[PDB]
Amino acid sequence: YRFHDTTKEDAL
Amino acid sequence: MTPNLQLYNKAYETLQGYGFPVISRKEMQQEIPYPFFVIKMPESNRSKYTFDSYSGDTNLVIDIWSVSDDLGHHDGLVKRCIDDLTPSVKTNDYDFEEDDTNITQLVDDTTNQELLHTSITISYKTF
């Protein structure tokens, strides 16, 4: 997996 | 406000409702009938407790003076205080929870009269 930001705009 | 003044105001709002006089110290021109309550400003320790809050130990002392003619009544005041101030006190900014309460009584002859002096200490953990 890569990095994903905390926010819903960067959901998994 | 500090937790000290918040608790001190709640303890006044409480004890001042019983109908006996409540004071922090007696002044010379002020006449106080027995029984009466003396109430003393809390001490408060504080320390970091979680990554998001302090917590600490806040110590309340209230102090009950009566003539020794009737001890069942004086003990009625002691029990009434404890039952109103425990297990928890809740106010605008702070919560208080009894860690322990200590009751000690003396027979006092300093005033050419046999008085009863009860000192009630309540330790509150606070959050």
């Binding site: 930001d5 959901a11 | 990554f51 860690d99 606070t126």
Partner: protein
Amino acid sequence: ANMKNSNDRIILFRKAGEKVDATKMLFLTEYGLSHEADTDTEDTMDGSYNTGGSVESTMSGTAKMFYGDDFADEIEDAVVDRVLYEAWEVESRIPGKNGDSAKFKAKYFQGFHNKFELKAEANGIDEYEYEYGVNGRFQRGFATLPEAVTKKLKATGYRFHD
């Protein structure tokens, strides 16, 4: 000087695969992150050598439970239902350099919660502690802190505030 306080770390979680903002782990008491390599060594009469086994990685912590909350209830659902969770560890005082200017330095994990214990004792606020098992390589990056949680909803008293 410039020593690093523990309480400047922010720990965040969310259930994997659902489009929602990450939720902050409030009232942590203590925390730890561990990495450990299961190396063997093989002996031979020419001489012994050390062999590069795989690495196990895990995150661990304790928190105080409170009434305005639903998250410990999610941890204990997650350990039993084997739900995959994303998690961040964010350093609230290292900001990103440019473009990431509004973000803070972070590690990103995904993995499973593997332990949850409630501890309750007379004369005490009940704790919970948990363990989280990281899958694979944790990933470095910069993370946006949920500003409405971290700076807008401030509260008076012994709760930390500016």
